[PDB]
Symmetry: C3
Subunit: 430 residues, 3 copies
Amino acid sequence: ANWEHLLSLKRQGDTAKRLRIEQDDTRLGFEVDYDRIIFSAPFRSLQDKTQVITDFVHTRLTHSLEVSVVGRSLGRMVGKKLLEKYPHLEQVYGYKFNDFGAIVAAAALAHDIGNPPFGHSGEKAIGEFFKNGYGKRYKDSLTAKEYQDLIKFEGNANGFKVLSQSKPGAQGGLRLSYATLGAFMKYPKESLPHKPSDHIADKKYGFFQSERALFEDVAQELGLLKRSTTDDVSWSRHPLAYLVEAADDICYTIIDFEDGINLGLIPEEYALEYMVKLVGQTIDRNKYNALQETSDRVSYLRALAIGTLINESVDTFMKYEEEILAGTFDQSLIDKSNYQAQITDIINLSIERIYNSREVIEKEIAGYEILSTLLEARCRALDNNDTHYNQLIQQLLAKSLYENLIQICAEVSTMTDGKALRNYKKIKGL
Amino acid sequence: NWEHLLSLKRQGDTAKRLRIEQDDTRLGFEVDYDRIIFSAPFRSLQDKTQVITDFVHTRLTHSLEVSVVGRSLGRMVGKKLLEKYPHLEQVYGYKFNDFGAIVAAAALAHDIGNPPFGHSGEKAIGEFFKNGYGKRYKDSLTAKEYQDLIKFEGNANGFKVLSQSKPGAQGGLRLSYATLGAFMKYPKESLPHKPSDHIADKKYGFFQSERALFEDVAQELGLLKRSTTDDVSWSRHPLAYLVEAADDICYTIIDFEDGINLGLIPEEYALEYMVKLVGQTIDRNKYNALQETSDRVSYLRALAIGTLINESVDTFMKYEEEILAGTFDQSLIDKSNYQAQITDIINLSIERIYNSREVIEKEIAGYEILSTLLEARCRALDNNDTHYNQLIQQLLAPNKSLYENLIQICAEVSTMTDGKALRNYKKIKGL
Amino acid sequence: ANWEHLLSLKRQGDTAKRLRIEQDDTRLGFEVDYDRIIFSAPFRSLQDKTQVITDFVHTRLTHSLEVSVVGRSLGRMVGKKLLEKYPHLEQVYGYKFNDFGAIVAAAALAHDIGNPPFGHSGEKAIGEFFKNGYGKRYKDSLTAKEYQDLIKFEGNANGFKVLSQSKPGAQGGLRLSYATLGAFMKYPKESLPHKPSDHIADKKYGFFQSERALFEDVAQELGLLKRSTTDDVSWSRHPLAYLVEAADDICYTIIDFEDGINLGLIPEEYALEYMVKLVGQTIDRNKYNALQETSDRVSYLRALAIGTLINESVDTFMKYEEEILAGTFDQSLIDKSNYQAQITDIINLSIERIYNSREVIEKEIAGYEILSTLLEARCRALDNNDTHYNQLIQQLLAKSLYENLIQICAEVSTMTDGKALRNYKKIKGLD
Ligand SMILES: [Mg+2]
Ligand SMILES: [Mg+2]
Ligand SMILES: [Mg+2]
């Protein structure tokens, strides 16, 4: 692989090359990608989409924003070092350090844009509907990969669909730069085979069969290395996808901890105990001791721990840069961290006190009923579109059979929590 | 013969009632109106909304306004009929207000038997017996008995509500046969289904349980036969054309008025859609001086309804003999010089009101509510011994053949107020 | 049978006898039973468990307290008279009249501890679930008596399980005296055969198969008389169980009536008419006429009527004491009352005005849906414990197949109304 091609400014449908040296610096394709996501309806809808805890103040919008800020910093710091290592990228092709930050920031901003409501439970409810619920009746009319898309419905792949879906008058969706789409693709494989190895890039899949042809275009414009030895297609990650992943991992690990503490689920005394190693060399104890509010103290620790992990991730990336470029790096960047023990203790505490708290369990149980109900109504109307009731369902909630089912899943998944519950209540009469 | 069409007979009468022998302070046709006003089914329309639920758009007010428009149509046609057939007054004693009373009473009761949620409610009841739990009874019912259920009709349920016999109260409201005739827009049974494209064959007007009653009504009125087979059908009482025009006029103009007051229809469309109907009579300087939206559209509504009333009266008299002979194949409004404008109004209401998201949501919820109450009642009917089914009995139907039980369940579910249908549904589901 | 053995102080697991004369009277086994019930979690939970009416001021907790007070008087007066009849019980064995009050008071206090919410409809909802709902799939994997425990699930039998359930660290449950467990058992039989005779003691059953071995121990220690060795075990009632039953019958009859009057369902004018014979000989007419509030007048009549019925029950018990000791008394104490005519009229009106009131019917209909939903979720999670959904259900809501099913029924039954409604609403997605 080669950074000239990995940094492609191509947009869908382009007939001519886009030279980096010919970009208007006030209209740089990578920075335009950020703005197009910010102003898109799917991104705006994240305001009414909650994280694990429903407080009105912990939204999927804020997490996506904070992940993108951490990603911009990671891309900027790695970008400067890549241009020192590969100076022809600047001198000949015209690339600049902010370009790497723009790519990572845009891809990070949109990482959760396709996830269904209710978190991983939402994904499992959609899958269970097609594995064992009403939807399993379609198994014999779909390819193995088409059915695997449904029974293992993946929010990551739905995000790729959302970013690129074509509609009359809007071919290419948001038409993001191919480098940004490459940085977005954490799992560059189709739904089959399922988990062929223990590599992180193979734990899940990144595109539906409906988007296979699109990512094939992306994968070769970027010059990504083929990996699979079969008709089952798979590529090794765009190097910048490692930075998108590190930003999410850092923010999920540290900010969930901060949230659990501010919400009262995690006792405040655990903050210093679990983060002292991550913040020791940079913390100002007199500043810390002078802070009077709990929230101000843990946010201070949060900023210090994120700064530490950002710098360490940048160094880890450059240490393994050639292995990543060759598709031989077998781990995430955070897996190589010197703070793995502290990171694991933090994650396990968040699992026990937040993700397995009674309120979250209750929300996930209700999410199953809500999604299963919306999925059954749309699928029954698809099967019998002639009855008066199914026509009403058609107007309220809303090609080949597979295209209709994957579209139904994508639409149910991008519904706000408020719209999913409201439509659920009408289907039930409340 | 108009003399027979103006029958004052009430169900169970053993002797004739002559028009000339009536006390005019107690005229049978006017008593009919009063009996409807005080009836429990009519009062229940206070808690029944139309498709839009604003608390100030009830089926009660719609019914009132339809009866007012009907009285005017009947009065005006009545005066002209007594000019055409003077023996009706000089010999038989009929007066022009008699025709207004008959049309007014029948129009007042037009929506009395309709289920909640509009046409979706009728469709939900039908689907229950066609493809839901109720299909199990198909083989225990005649074709016409089953057709009553799978194509359950609010018009036919209204006839049942007006006439249903109960202990201590045989004959229901016991309205004059002229009023029941003016009420019957579809004087046929559920089968055969839509035998022609005649307006009177678009639906049916009585269930099998009321067939014998309407047979008595049609013979007394001297209605003309339309079938000579065991599938009975008759030509419409001429005054049923006026009941229908009152409904057509009010549904067209007042839905529009409501859509504008509710925000569903942009006010900027008001003049454009109504200009042909009000052009010659509108005082434009008065219209521009009115400061409230509700005042401007109620002025246009009054002008458009007055225009359509006057024209409908003239259409009725132009075709009176075809109507009296049962050869008129259309509605009065179908012959209107404003058919194109009426159609544009109705289509705009369909797009902006009936297909609005709030109306769609309510109809979807209605399907669940009604389907649930029907299944609860029908399972309780099939196994009345279980504790649960005894409670369902005490709750939904306190105090017969299989068909009579099923049609009664449909009639009772249909006449539930909005509040009681949703509340009972909530309990059977625990909300 | 013998009163020396019937008054056993044995607790589950004991290795040595407990002599009454050797008890510390500040720690008397029978009085300790009362305290153990008061402080137990199942008894505390009755604060959030409502009766038929839902006024927040009519709890199953208050009823249990008042029954235990009336039960203590019954036991005290019968105990004093029994020690007169059989003086050796005090002279040689050391028993005192308050011992009989304590036994009856503790058993009466715990009579409703195992009942599901929603009254007898609640028990019927659980049974219907296993008879015709999802639970019917287990029929062929259960013995006839195991399945009968489920389809005729009995709150009395669940109470016995609650008081005796052994769990790690707590063998014997609340570890109540065997005399108290004997007085608690109004139906000393298994679920099958169903109603072998018309005797009150055969109308229901008193222990599940899971607790059979245990009542066998209790019945053996108490010397209860065997009533069947047909492999279907049954015993004659502990004599004090008649007093526990009389306390519940007096309180339910008189206090349901008073509550209905205070709530408006029964017109106050019925109070004196139905109760004059029960209070006439002891009522102070001057006091009654001076009382100004309705609630004050009916509570005065209630105290008088309850006092009359307690004295009569004490006399009925002593008259039939030997027949009861011999297991040949075939009726309840209240069945022999001279006021049976007045008791019946009181009960019938309460049924008509309270138990068949629309509010109560509605609550019971919803209870069917709430209990069926909670039972189905638990049972699907039992059958497929591997799915992600069923593991979530397990973290939220929570041996042989039968032991798992009877435990699921016991846990759903002992839920407070608040957690049952909340968990049900979560399972259904409602707030
Ligand atoms: Mg994330
Ligand atoms: Mg109408
Ligand atoms: Mg009781």
